[PDB]
Every structure is written in structure tokens, then in C-alpha cells.
Design a protein around this ligand. Structure first.
Ligand SMILES: Cc1[nH]c2ccc(-c3ccccc3)cc2c1CCN
Ligand SMILES: Cc1[nH]c2ccc(-c3ccccc3)cc2c1CCN
Ligand SMILES: [Ca+2]
Ligand SMILES: [Ca+2]
Ligand SMILES: [Ca+2]
Ligand SMILES: [Ca+2]
Lengths: 214, 214
């Protein structure tokens, strides 16, 4: 009884010293001759070379350097078993290395300044613009690339203080208080923020400048 | 050819929807009857009950909740092959789950205010005190719980702007400049900071109060 496929899930940007052992190969029939192991493939004997390596005698698969999942996210290697007489004993076994995500990219805003506009008498609830930011990290399986949006401050304060909201996850700045007037205040400037791990991580700052129109 | 041991490495505090498929069991006795798969061990039928489960007619090993490594960092379970007559077929296979760590804990100083002191006439380089922050994440195999120390600000900014420094990894504050004097400034108040992922992570802040002596 065994696994149908056995991938090796390896957290990226890892520490300690290298090499590191990952799993150990063994062939069914190694009381026949002595067995010498070898790995091949992209990440072993093709570029990037020398990222993975196997111990000839012991069969330990080794990690040589830390992996950036944000560069290569999975490898496909092959295990080779060759007796001391030169005989390929088994078929090269599929070795699959899945690189899992650490939170090693701060979220970075689309543009340094975002510019949008709206009109004096729009009903509370009304879209005005959408900002964004990208986090190069993963957002399907981890929260490391999932972004939360917020508004820090609003200048000028004038008719109110919470003049706008931004949707936490889509980045849509709405107006929420009727009371706009282009003559009294023509150009608000929102100081906005993107925060990875869904608000519990790093925070990048940028600005959105809403102009109110006649 | 196979691994002598295939643990499953599962990033903690995972996203997406659950359950989640991890690997699939299979018995090299299934070209016979229709086998039915079950699962035992702490995390399965012991406390905490129900974190893993396997689809009886597929063998897929499912994860029901997101894991917290700092709550439990490893699981040893057993999978079971039975036919329609509850008949144990081969022995139970061992399932080893290795919860890999994410940066889900901000660094916490041990006290809000460290108190130290040093004589006015000590030489530049002279140690003074050593502050400390602890991060619950792994600092062995990952940077998530590796702290980096820094002085935010010193007040009063008398005589020089920066009279002290701190070891980035050890927490030891030392004197970097000449000119302490109890008569002129008898105490300095150092805003200290601790940042995880060895600097590129989350921060909290404390203060170290250094008294100058005759
Ligand atoms: C619980 C968990 N964490 C993962 C992290 C990464 C990949 C993964 C699989 C194939 C290619 C690339 C990545 C799969 C998983 C799963 C199983 C959920 N289908
Ligand atoms: C994040 C991470 N990566 C690993 C890689 C390997 C082993 C490991 C498990 C059993 C024996 C020897 C080593 C443990 C870990 C952890 C959890 C850190 N408490
Ligand atoms: Ca790499
Ligand atoms: Ca748990
Ligand atoms: Ca941490
Ligand atoms: Ca953690």
C-alpha cells in the first residue's frame, strides 16, 4: 500500500545550511548488485543546473540552494538506479517537487498616483474609480498574495471625514456621503493602502485623487 | 522504485475551500475486490477529531480545516485497506503529515520597557543592555520567526543625533559615540523595533530607557 503519486512539497526561501535532505530513494531489488543513484532533468542536469542532487550511494535527494517559488514553482526530475555493473535496473522514477509559497513579496501599487473623478450629486453607494495593487505571491492556496485595501486619510477633510469608502477586496472607491460640491471642495486626495495576507502583513501606500465635477 | 518514506508537507493556515485533497491511497491488492479506505490516529479519530478524513471508495486523503503549525506541527496517522467484509487486507500504512510554517505571528518584545544603564565614560563599543523579542514561527528552517533589531529613534537627540546602536540579531545595545554626561543628559529613551523575516516582515515597537551614571 502506497501513494498513487508522492510529490515533495518544499517551502521556498528556506533557511539553515545547504544541502538539505528531502526524501530517500530506494529500488525494489538492491541485493543484486550495489546500486548507484542519479537524478536528471530541469533543475538537476539541465538549467537550472545543480539545484537538486542525489547521494550516489545513500539515495538521499538533496536541496542545494533555496528555491524562489516566484521564479520556478515546480520541478520534474527523474530518478535513475544503476547497478555497479552498468545495468539500468528499474525505470527512471518520476520525481515531482512542488514549491510552496512564503510571503516574500510586499504588495506593490499599480501606479504611484491614481486619478479619477465623479459628479457633485451622485447618490451614496456610487463607484468613482478602481485602484489596484499586485502581490507577486500566491493567492489561490495561501493568503500571502491576497490583498486588502483601505483608505488612510482624506484631505481636505471639509464636508465630512468619511467622504469615501474603498471595497476591502476589489479596490473600488465609492462616495458614501451626499454633500459634494465643486465650488466648496473641487479635488479630494485619498491616501490609500494595500496590505498582503489579507490585511495581516505588509502595507504599501499610494494615493488616489478624485476630482469633483459640475 | 519508491521513497522509503513519503511525508506530506502541508503549508499551515491555507486558503481556498475545504476539504482539500492531499494524496491518494492505493493497495497493491485492488485488482481483486472493491477496497474501501478508512483512517485512524490523532487528528482523525483521536483529538483533535476530524482534521483529516479519507473518501472510503477513492482513497483520497482530505484535509478538513486549515492547520496551525504552532498548535500542532506533525501528525502520524494510519490508513486501512478493507474489503466489503471489514476484512483487513494488508497491514496499515503510516501517514506522516509535516505542517510547514507560514509567517502568521507578529514578533513580540518580552517587556514593553527595558531598563538599562551605563557609565558616562565608557569607550565606544561598550555594551549596555540587551533587549529581546520572541516570534512564535519557525526560526530553524524558515525566516518567519527570525527577528531583526533596530533603533527607531533616540530622544533627546543630545549630544549627537545617534548615541547608541543595537545588534541586529542579538538585541545588545552598545554605545557608538563619545560624549555621554550625566550632568547634561542623565537618561535617554530609545524606541526599539523588532522585525520578523529577518527584516522584511512585520514589526512591533518597544522602548529601552538608558540611565547615564557618574
Ligand atoms: C493542501 C495543498 N497545498 C498545496 C500547495 C500547492 C499545490 C500544487 C499542486 C500542483 C501544482 C502546483 C501546486 C497543491 C496543494 C494542496 C492540495 C490541493 N489541491
Ligand atoms: C516548515 C518546516 N519545514 C520542514 C522540513 C522538514 C521538517 C522535519 C520533520 C521531521 C524530521 C526532520 C525534519 C520539518 C519542517 C518544518 C516545520 C518546522 N517546525
Ligand atoms: Ca530557484
Ligand atoms: Ca490545528
Ligand atoms: Ca513571524
Ligand atoms: Ca507560523
Amino acid at each position: 500500500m502506497d501513494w498513487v503519486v508522492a510529490p515533495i512539497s518544499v517551502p521556498e526561501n528556506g533557511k539553515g545550511p545547504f544541502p538539505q535532505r528531502l526524501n530517500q530513494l530506494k529500488s525494489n531489488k538492491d541485493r543484486d548488485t550495489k546500486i548507484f543513484y542519479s537524478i536528471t532533468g530541469p533543475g538537476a542536469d539541465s538549467p537550472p543546473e545543480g539545484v537538486f542532487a542525489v547521494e550516489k550511494e545513500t539515495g538521499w535527494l538533496l536541496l542545494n540552494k533555496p528555491l524562489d517559488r516566484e521564479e520556478i514553482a515546480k520541478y520534474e526530475l527523474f530518478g535513475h538506479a544503476v547497478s555497479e555493473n552498468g545495468a539500468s535496473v528499474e525505470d527512471p522514477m518520476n520525481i515531482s517537487i512542488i514549491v510552496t509559497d512564503q510571503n516574500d513579496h510586499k504588495p506593490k501599487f499599480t501606479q504611484d498616483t491614481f486619478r479619477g473623478s465623479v459628479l457633485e450629486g451622485v447618490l451614496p453607494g456610487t463607484s468613482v474609480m478602481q485602484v489596484t495593487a499586485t502581490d507577486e505571491d500566491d493567492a489561490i492556496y495561501t493568503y500571502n498574495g491576497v490583498v486588502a485595501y483601505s483608505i488612510h486619510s482624506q484631505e481636505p477633510k471639509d464636508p465630512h471625514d468619511l467622504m469615501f469608502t474603498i471595497h476591502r477586496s476589489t479596490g473600488t472607491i465609492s462616495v458614501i456621503s451626499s454633500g459634494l460640491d465643486r465650488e466648496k471642495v473641487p479635488e479630494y486626495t485619498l491616501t490609500i493602502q494595500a496590505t498582503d495576507m489579507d490585511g495581516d502583513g505588509s502595507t504599501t501606500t499610494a494615493v488616489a485623487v478624485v476630482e469633483i465635477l459640475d
